[PDB]
Enzyme design. Sequence first.
Site, PDB file in Angstrom:
ATOM      1  N   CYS A 117      -7.581 -16.456  -0.849  1.00 13.88           N
ATOM      2  CA  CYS A 117      -6.562 -16.439  -1.531  1.00 13.88           C
ATOM      3  C   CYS A 117      -6.601 -15.275  -2.641  1.00 13.88           C
ATOM      4  CB  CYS A 117      -5.798 -17.614  -2.273  1.00 13.88           C
ATOM      5  SG  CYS A 117      -4.329 -17.433  -3.129  1.00 13.88           S
ATOM      6  N   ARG A 145      -5.169 -15.976  -6.562  1.00 10.98           N
ATOM      7  CA  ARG A 145      -5.612 -16.827  -7.588  1.00 10.98           C
ATOM      8  C   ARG A 145      -5.867 -16.734  -8.983  1.00 10.98           C
ATOM      9  NH1 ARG A 145     -11.300 -17.968  -4.963  1.00 10.98           N
ATOM     10  NH2 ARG A 145     -10.869 -16.224  -3.465  1.00 10.98           N
ATOM     11  N   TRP A 155       4.409 -16.661  -4.768  1.00 15.57           N
ATOM     12  CA  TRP A 155       5.410 -15.309  -4.223  1.00 15.57           C
ATOM     13  C   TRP A 155       4.828 -14.515  -3.203  1.00 15.57           C
ATOM     14  CZ3 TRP A 155       4.121 -16.478  -9.430  1.00 15.57           C
ATOM     15  CH2 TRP A 155       3.069 -15.885  -9.840  1.00 15.57           C
ATOM     16  N   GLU A 162       2.238  -9.158   3.339  1.00 16.65           N
ATOM     17  CA  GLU A 162       2.671 -10.090   4.239  1.00 16.65           C
ATOM     18  C   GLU A 162       3.771 -10.069   5.218  1.00 16.65           C
ATOM     19  OE1 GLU A 162       1.344 -14.259   2.341  1.00 16.65           O
ATOM     20  OE2 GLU A 162       1.775 -12.818   0.683  1.00 16.65           O
TER      21      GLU A 162
END
Lengths: 414, 419
Positions: free
Chosen positions: B117, B120, B289, B294
């Site tokens: 991730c 984070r 979000w 992506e």
Amino acid sequence: RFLKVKNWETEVVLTDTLHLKSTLETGCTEYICMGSIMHPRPEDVATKDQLFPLAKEFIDQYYSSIKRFGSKAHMERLEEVNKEIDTTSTYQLKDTELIYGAKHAWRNASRCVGRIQWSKLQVFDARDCTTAHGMFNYICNHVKYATNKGNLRSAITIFPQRTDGKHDFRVWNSQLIRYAGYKQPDGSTLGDPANVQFTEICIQQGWKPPRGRFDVLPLLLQANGNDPELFQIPPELVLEVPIRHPKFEWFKDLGLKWYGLPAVSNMLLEIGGLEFSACPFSGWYMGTEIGVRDYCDNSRYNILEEVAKKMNLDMRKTSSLWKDQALVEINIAVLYSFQSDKVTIVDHHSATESFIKHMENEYRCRGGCPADWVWIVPPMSGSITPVFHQEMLNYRLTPSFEYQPDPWNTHVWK
Amino acid sequence: RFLKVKNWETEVVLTDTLHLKSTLETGCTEYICMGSIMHPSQHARRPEDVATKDQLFPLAKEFIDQYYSSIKRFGSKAHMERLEEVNKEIDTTSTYQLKDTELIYGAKHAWRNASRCVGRIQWSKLQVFDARDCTTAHGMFNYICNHVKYATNKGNLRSAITIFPQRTDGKHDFRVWNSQLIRYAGYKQPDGSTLGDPANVQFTEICIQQGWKPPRGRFDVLPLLLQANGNDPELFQIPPELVLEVPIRHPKFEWFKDLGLKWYGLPAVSNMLLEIGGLEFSACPFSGWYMGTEIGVRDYCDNSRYNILEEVAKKMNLDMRKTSSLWKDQALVEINIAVLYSFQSDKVTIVDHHSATESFIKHMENEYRCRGGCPADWVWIVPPMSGSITPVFHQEMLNYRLTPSFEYQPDPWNTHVWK
Ligand code: HEM
Ligand code: HEM
Ligand SMILES: Cc1cc(N)nc(COc2cc(CCN3CCCCC3)cc(F)c2F)c1
Ligand SMILES: Cc1cc(N)nc(COc2cc(CCN3CCCCC3)cc(F)c2F)c1
Ligand SMILES: C[C@H](O)[C@H](O)[C@H]1CNc2nc(N)[nH]c(=O)c2N1
Ligand SMILES: C[C@H](O)[C@H](O)[C@H]1CNc2nc(N)[nH]c(=O)c2N1
Ligand SMILES: [Zn+2]
């Protein structure tokens, strides 16, 4: 006994059996992965008893490759190598073995996306070389042959292997052709900032620098553990390409150029436990190596801000993606420039495509293909190249290209 | 012993001791690295179904020990009683129940431990909705709608997780069958092609086979397929007023809006398993979000996704005869500019990959500074375009598996016996 890798874009699954033949560390442990670490002594030369199995495994490998495993020639060679390791604490490769070894070190180079070409490699045996002048003669010949008037041919020149570690041959240059970098009193950098330290070494050694932005550095050649010596590559042998853009008239006014021949000279070639500390090899460029890394790394030529300015991009907020937009046009420019000058180059798309074809073929006929996804994926547009979606097993086969300490960090000056 | 990571752009070296607390195998060995394999290891912390006491208690003891360590206790009265409370609880129910504080701690630390991730840096700022009292698909829907509404927050998105009751025997799993709460349908056309989102073709069929009436468009928000207590899943239509969507336009190409493209605002992973002291939360939809790449790189440009590069390239008037024109690369940039510009003009929270990766470096610094390390998966952290012009490309990362964590789990339709 079997491992599987999946392409998540095509669903193709390959089955890696070759990794059983790996025998050296990756750096990872069972509980921590070091897949993104870049690098996980001169008295360190193999003892007799260390060399015996390493030579056996390589000679066994070689005779298996030529379908002569078990043959009378295989057994006598095996006996002949052991004789030299006994009498002389080392042994000498036959020319066939040297060529097989150098070709397979490339084939086994998990970080290299160009290996579809591995079996097409000109091997220049330079193990009779004894002096720096001799290395210079060999390297000039390498460069002329490899450059081949823009129609590049991959090639490697192999200087004498290590003996006691106190008589190493070394190209002190990390690549054969590199531009100089010079730090200014005001802290700015003229030229290639990556080579500032090497440029200082050359300057100190006697080199008289033009103090420009694209000065080809001189070779700094060490033969037999003696002090390295300077040689200026003859300029008619350094093929260069001025960078223009097919659409932006102004691009040529950046005054950019690059050299055509990528030629790694700082890496160690390990065949059968023998170590060839000086083995410059060359191929041809992928566009991103110049266009993304050489020109756009902040630690390198750092022209993104220069270019985006000429592009009239909003550079107050990153989210305008001015860096990304400018990076693409540079990489277009680089490919267009090479292609127009009929100098061999390969864009990251063709290169990654070829590599997938090559990887699948290597799984068919060899049982796998060790691959370093962190290195195989190009440094721009990663997910729109097919290798991004390709799972890859990384492991170390020998013969291999290895890293080795920088010569100035260990050399004992005469 | 004690591992070092270097950043080759800045020469900053960090020293990792946290990895010593790693529990599960990465898949790697000294002889093979699996860092590009998506599911390298099947090493779990507990066996198949409901575990014996010797299996579950040591995992429970470890999490409780970690949680009481975290708050400057350990050995305190509350800690030792909690140990006994959990021990008696496993003795009598073969499981145990997390206190609300331990639940919040665990969910936050699973996100904190999520090696893949990039976002984070917000890990401690996570809204945890305890839904462990849930009992039915209708209940699950109510909770998920409240999650979506709270998380969407009229564009000013907020990180949230909603934690449905844990696994007991494996038969009575709670599952969100949707992989994400908000995804577009994918329709297998008669002429071989695909309309909508091709990744979702199979789930879309399950939904239609379950009685969903497909509008059969390119951006049909999928229904929820919720499974409670192991029962057959149930379709629910998320009320559209809850599904914030952003129409994609471009700040220079006025023709871009005519591509008819939109995306949703809320990414919400709903198919992962949250794992805390041996307890398995098979339904734990979490949301934050988007990073713009992506949508604009992966969702739009992947060949087996929306795959709009040729269209955008054609409209841009690009040499599409050969790869070396880098026409894909040029379109890819413009598309991600369009995605970023549209989310920002609608004041829907979004982060670009420069800002997001810069933040993750800062997070790494923080984690090494106070935690002795930060597990990160270079393969997932580096954005899918312009890798080397972002700081993380140049940053060595150590990957290791810390618990609590989010884990992958089988898609429920491969496992679920219908009734
Ligand atoms: C012929 C065309 C070739 C192409 C297009 C190509 C492409 C590349 C690229 C893009 C890289 C990453 C370079 C970097 O990021 O620094 C690389 C690495 C490498 N190449 Fe190739 N390469 C070629 C030929 C060769 C040859 C002829 C050899 C050896 C005989 C070789 C051995 C290697 C090795 C060992 C690496 C890894 C360097 C390292 O570990 O740091 N390559 N290649
Ligand atoms: C708040 C803003 C967030 C941002 C910008 C962000 C960014 C990302 C991105 C870009 C990925 C990779 C996406 C992909 O390519 O599939 C990812 C993965 C992941 N994120 Fe975050 N994320 C955020 C919030 C969260 C939250 C709130 C959680 C948990 C509560 C979380 C847990 C994870 C996990 C477990 C993965 C791995 C997913 C997988 O293995 O498929 N993230 N994140
Ligand atoms: C045979 C071959 C072909 C090819 N296409 N490429 C390579 C690698 O080539 C070069 C790479 C660099 C940069 C090296 N890089 C610096 C940062 C740390 C990692 C190594 C400079 C050069 F001049 C190169 F020729 C080798
Ligand atoms: C909390 C969170 C925040 C964020 N910013 N991003 C994510 C990732 O969420 C999604 C991920 C995907 C793709 C998942 N991927 C598909 C290919 C195989 C590997 C898994 C689709 C979606 F709609 C998503 F919302 C999660
Ligand atoms: C083969 C490879 O692991 C696979 O394509 C991965 C690569 N890195 C990724 N990184 C992110 N963030 N998301 C992904 O889906 C993937 N896919
Ligand atoms: C830390 C990280 O491994 C490092 O930046 C790597 C990433 N991938 C790379 N890939 C290539 N081809 N060349 C590089 O120099 C690097 N650098
Ligand atoms: Zn690894």
